[PDB]
């Protein structure tokens, strides 16, 4: 009953969950004030970059050194880290003392002392001939510009040493070590005690993204995304922030929470108006905060018969330790009586249950405020990872939480209410920031080892100028043997004659039909040509689908259906009754004997239509046109789609002798001298050749460039060992190469935390449109993370950087090999004519050339560098697939 009198007296120190969640919202604004460039100089929560770029993943290994300077004594530590799967850290340390002589003395004397102790420790500890990282955690206020550079703002706890404040403490420890000359030190890291706590816990639990200390002081750190950290340059990846939240409220943002006892401790402190959040929650001030509630209640005659004692009025005489005791004993109000008597009072039972209760109120308020600001931190980690349910572990240290009986549990229960959208685990750190500082340099080496590891794989996909010139000539060599009559049949690149013998001039006019047929949906095309200067080409299409009934039926039914569509189209343009010549794009394997004769070899892509294979496709087509009555169309020619792409850029540019398509497929064509084409009789004139160059390398001629990933794609394709040059440069394949690289890294622990999604094992997930967005993303790489979340993969910042890099390397090699092939073509076009300076144009189509951000560029420079004499322009075509078929006809019609 004295209880509810107490609670009604202390009502403003019992905080509703509502108040806590409004404190979280305030703290989140304070976090954003510190992270932002313009608001940070006046921000009370300093949000200091720590330069730690990663938590531990567990595979760290090595030997490391550490210093902990807390003052009047420091420790020198040695941490053995073994990757055996146990994650069991081996430690040794020693304390040594800095006496007032050195302490109040000069800076360089102070560090010469420290450098000596370190060497005395390495001497005792065996290791002094080893060059090891350090390892540096000291808590005095600092301005930290680098992992290895931190400036002393001021001293604390009795350090007067001159020449230190405003001077880099790493330069001081390093210069001292040079002066001794007996040992040497590797990379240094300067790490705050919370960051140390996070790091050491994260070596056991790799979900630990928050360090926490409720000590005599209180502070917390978390992992944070570089896009939100204005004070450090770059938006990629994440970095740990030292929040310094003890200073929360220094500008008065908590003054409606803070009671008068809170006011009075601030005035009685060493640092008035500083660290007000600490002074509410933490160990130094917590028992003192009970002292004042006792003093004032007794001055009001609600306790002790209005009577005081000289000890009750001395600051510090009622201690945090006295709270832990009173709340911890079975009989708490006897241990209360005992503590009160020690202070010179004669308590009653009601005086003791009152003192007991005030203790719970103060200690519960401390654990609740922590929850509040832990709630804001948890909340932001949630929004950054961007999923609804969160697993995150908090490493925790400090004497309040470890040694006070109920506070850890209260914190656990309160945090978990305040954030129901989280599964949160707490893990206490024992050996403290001695381990932690060391572990920061272990992770620093791990990141390096892994970076070099995965950059050593990506070198196999990086080709030299000399490697490309080799494949350039392996292209020519294997072009020649396709033209000559002997070797054509053994030849992977068949160099098939197109029977397209003449390119445009300004003369052509009139309307032409075009039929682009492959796969289940064709298009019918009307193409109108305007001759003369200016003018150009005008196109109308319509798309039709071949019913599933029709392609599992007879072959004549297939082409009647096709002809109904042609008849529907030109009646849709309003031409019904008009007869026109027709160009024809048929993409199936075909031996083409004439320009208007081509024999279907084998059906593909799900056409079962009978009576077709082994037949000339144009006869089938016009035998189907004959049938329709009254319907007459002249079928002039049939073409490979590359040939069309080139002829399409023949009308823009007089000089275009070369088609190219880097598509879902890849192929290329030039006009070769009739001299050199040995399967067609006669030497007079020139002839366009359909290279079918995606087959470059199916004899093995590329097999020394082919990485295991190229072979992984090759072996699980529908056409194993066929079309290899295609599978390096285009289409479905590059995503698959990327995917197999990623799988490789992840098996090696180099990506995705070692863990392969079943969703990562799914073929085809990386589509060329996604590689295009990936490689065109920059800065924070939020577009890569989105895509990765879209495909069901881990979206973390660090994994984006790699995925982006793997993509860029795969796509570069693709353009580069594509230039080296296109360079062979333009050089032999020179060598056929004995010419040297040669100006050429390449019409180009296909999905990846137009839409990939860097690909068109990279290939341009590749053929400039590999074919120095040729001057090569590339003109984009746009649907030379079907439109080129009509335009091959208009030139054919000119004869
Ligand atoms: N001197 C101490 C000390 C260390 C550890 C402990 S402790 O280990 O017992 N508690 C952990 C936390 O205590 C304090 O809040 C520390 N901040 C401050 O005292 C403080 C106070 C005012 C300003 C700045 C500042 C300013 C600029 C840059 C860095 C720091 C820091 C915080 O850095 C530490 O992480 C206890 C006491
Ligand atoms: N089916 C398709 C298709 C069509 C267009 C596209 S595409 O329009 O996206 N790219 C254009 C190029 O793709 C591939 O290289 C094509 N080669 C083959 O299909 C191929 C594949 C294997 C063997 C032989 C062969 C070899 C010797 C003789 C005859 C034929 C040809 C090529 O005809 C086309 O020039 C993508 C895919």
Curated annotation (Swiss-Prot):
Keywords: Acetylation, Allosteric enzyme, ATP-binding, Cytoplasm, Glycolysis, Kinase, Membrane, Mitochondrion, Mitochondrion outer membrane, Nucleotide-binding, Repeat, Transferase. It is a peripheral membrane protein. ATP 1 binds at residues 14, 68-73, 409-410. Residues 505-639 are annotated as: Hexokinase small subdomain 2. Residues 640-879 are annotated as: Hexokinase large subdomain 2. The keyword Phosphoprotein does not apply. It catalyses: a D-hexose + ATP = a D-hexose 6-phosphate + ADP + H(+); D-fructose + ATP = D-fructose 6-phosphate + ADP + H(+); D-glucose + ATP = D-glucose 6-phosphate + ADP + H(+). D-glucose 1 binds at residues 139-140, 156-157, 192-193, 219, 244, 275-278. Residues 1-442, 448-890 form the Hexokinase domain. D-glucose 6-phosphate 1 binds at residues 68-72, 193, 216, 397-399, 433. PROSITE patterns: HEXOKINASE_1, HEXOKINASE_2. Hexokinase activity is specifically inhibited by 2,6-disubstituted glucosamines. It holds the Pfam family Hexokinase_1. Pathway: Carbohydrate metabolism; hexose metabolism; Carbohydrate degradation; glycolysis; D-glyceraldehyde 3-phosphate and glycerone phosphate from D-glucose: step 1/4. InterPro entries: ATPase_NBD (IPR043129), Hexokinase (IPR001312), Hexokinase_BS (IPR019807), Hexokinase_C (IPR022673), Hexokinase_N (IPR022672). One of its GO terms (biological process) is positive regulation of angiogenesis. D-glucose 2 binds at residues 587-588, 604-605, 640-641, 666-667, 692, 723-726. The keyword Repeat applies. Monomer. Interacts with TIGAR; the interaction increases hexokinase activity in a hypoxia- and HIF1A-dependent manner. Belongs to the hexokinase family. Catalyzes the phosphorylation of hexose, such as D-glucose and D-fructose, to hexose 6-phosphate (D-glucose 6-phosphate and D-fructose 6-phosphate, respectively). Mediates the initial step of glycolysis by catalyzing phosphorylation of D-glucose to D-glucose 6-phosphate. Plays a key role in maintaining the integrity of the outer mitochondrial membrane by preventing the release of apoptogenic molecules from the intermembrane space and subsequent apoptosis. This is Hexokinase-2.
């Amino acid at each position: 009953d004295q209880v509810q009198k107490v609670d009604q007296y202390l009502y403003h120190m019992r905080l509703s969950d509502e108040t806590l969640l409004e404190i979280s919202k305030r703290f989140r604004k304070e976090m954003e004030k510190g992270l932002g460039a313009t608001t940070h100089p006046t921000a009370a929560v300093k949000m200091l970059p720590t330069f730690v770029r990663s938590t531990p993943d567990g595979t760290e290994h090595g030997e490391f050194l550490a210093l902990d300077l807390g003052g009047t004594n420091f420790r020198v530590l040695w941490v053995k880290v073994t990757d055996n799967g146990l994650q069991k850290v081996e430690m040794e340390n020693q304390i040594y003392a800095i006496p007032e002589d050195i302490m109040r003395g000069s800076g360089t004397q102070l560090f010469d002392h420290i450098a000596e102790c370190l060497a005395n420790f390495m001497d005792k500890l065996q290791i002094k001939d080893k060059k090891l990282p350090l390892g540096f955690t000291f808590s005095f206020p600092c301005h930290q510009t680098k992992l290895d550079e931190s400036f002393l703002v001021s001293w604390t706890k009795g350090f007067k040493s001159s020449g230190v404040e405003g001077r880099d403490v790493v330069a001081l420890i390093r210069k001292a070590i040079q002066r001794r000359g007996d040992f040497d030190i590797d990379i240094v890291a300067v790490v705050n005690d919370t960051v140390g706590t996070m790091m050491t816990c994260g070596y056991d639990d790799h979900n630990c993204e928050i360090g926490l200390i409720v000590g005599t002081g209180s502070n917390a750190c978390y992992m944070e995304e570089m896009r939100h950290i204005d004070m450090v340059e770059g938006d990629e990846g994440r970095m740990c922030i030292n929040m310094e939240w003890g200073a929360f409220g220094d500008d008065g943002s908590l003054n409606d929470i803070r009671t008068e006892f809170d006011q009075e401790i601030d005035m009685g402190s060493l640092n008035p108006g500083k660290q007000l959040f600490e002074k509410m929650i933490s160990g130094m001030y917590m028992g003192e905060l009970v002292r004042l509630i006792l003093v004032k209640m007794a001055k009001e005659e609600l306790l002790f018969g209005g009577k005081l004692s000289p000890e009750l009025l001395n600051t510090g005489r009622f201690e945090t330790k006295d709270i832990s005791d009173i709340e911890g004993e079975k009989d708490g109000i006897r241990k209360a009586r005992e503590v009160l008597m020690r202070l010179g009072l004669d308590p009653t039972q009601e005086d003791c249950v009152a003192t007991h209760r005030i203790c719970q109120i103060v200690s519960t308020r401390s654990a609740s405020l922590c929850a509040a600001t832990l709630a804001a931190v948890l909340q932001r980690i949630k929004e950054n990872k961007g999923e609804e349910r969160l697993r995150s572990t908090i490493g925790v240290d400090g004497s309040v939480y470890k040694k006070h009986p109920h506070f850890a549990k209260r914190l656990h229960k309160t945090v978990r209410r305040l954030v129901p959208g989280c599964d949160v685990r707490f893990l206490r750190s024992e050996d403290g920031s001695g381990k932690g500082a060391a572990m920061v340099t272990a992770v620093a080496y791990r990141l390096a080892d892994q970076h070099r590891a995965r950059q050593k794989t990506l070198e196999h996909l990086q080709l030299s100028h000399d490697q490309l010139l080799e494949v350039k000539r392996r292209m020519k060599v294997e072009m020649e043997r396709g033209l000559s009559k002997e070797t054509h049949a053994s030849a992977p690149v068949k160099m098939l004659p197109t029977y397209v013998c003449a390119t445009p001039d300004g003369t052509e006019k009139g309307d032409f039909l075009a039929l682009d047929l492959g796969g289940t949906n064709f298009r019918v095309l009307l193409v109108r040509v305007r001759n003369g200067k200016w003018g150009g080409v005008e196109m109308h299409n319509k798309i039709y689908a071949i019913p599933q009934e029709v392609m599992h039926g007879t072959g004549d039914e297939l082409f009647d259906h096709i002809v109904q569509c042609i008849a529907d189209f030109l009646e849709y343009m309003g031409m019904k009754g008009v007869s026109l010549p027709l160009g024809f794009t048929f993409s199936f394997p075909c031996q083409q004997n004439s320009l208007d004769e081509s024999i279907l070899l084998k059906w593909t892509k799900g056409f079962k239509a009978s009576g077709c294979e082994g037949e000339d496709v144009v006869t089938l087509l016009k035998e189907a046109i004959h049938r329709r009555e009254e319907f007459d169309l002249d079928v002039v020619a049939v073409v490979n789609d590359t040939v069309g792409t080139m002829m399409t850029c023949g009308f823009e540019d007089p000089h275009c002798e070369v088609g190219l398509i880097v598509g879902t497929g890849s192929n290329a064509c030039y006009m070769e001298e009739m001299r050199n084409v040995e399967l067609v009789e006669g030497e007079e004139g020139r002839m366009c050749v359909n290279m079918e160059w995606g087959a470059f390398g199916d004899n093995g001629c590329l097999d020394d460039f082919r990485t295991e990933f190229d072979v992984a794609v090759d072996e699980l394709s529908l056409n194993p060992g066929k079309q290899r040059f295609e599978k390096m440069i285009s289409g479905m394949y590059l995503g698959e190469i990327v995917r197999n690289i990623l799988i490789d890294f992840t098996k090696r622990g180099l990506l995705f935390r070692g863990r392969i999604s079943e969703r990562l094992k799914t073929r085809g997930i990386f589509e060329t449109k996604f590689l295009s967005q990936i490689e065109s993303d920059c800065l924070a790489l939020l577009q890569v993370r989105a895509i990765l979340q879209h495909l069901g993969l881990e979206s973390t910042c660090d994994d984006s950087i790699i995925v982006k890099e793997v993509c860029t390397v795969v796509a570069r090699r693709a353009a580069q090999l594509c230039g080296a092939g296109m360079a062979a073509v333009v050089d032999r076009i020179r060598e056929n004519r004995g010419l040297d300076a040669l100006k050429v144009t390449v019409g180009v189509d296909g999905t990846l050339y137009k839409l990939h951000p860097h690909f068109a560029k990279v290939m341009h420079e590749t053929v400039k560098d590999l074919a120095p004499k040729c001057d090569v322009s590339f003109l984009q075509s746009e649907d030379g697939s079907g439109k080129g078929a009509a335009l091959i006809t208009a030139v054919a019609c000119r004869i």
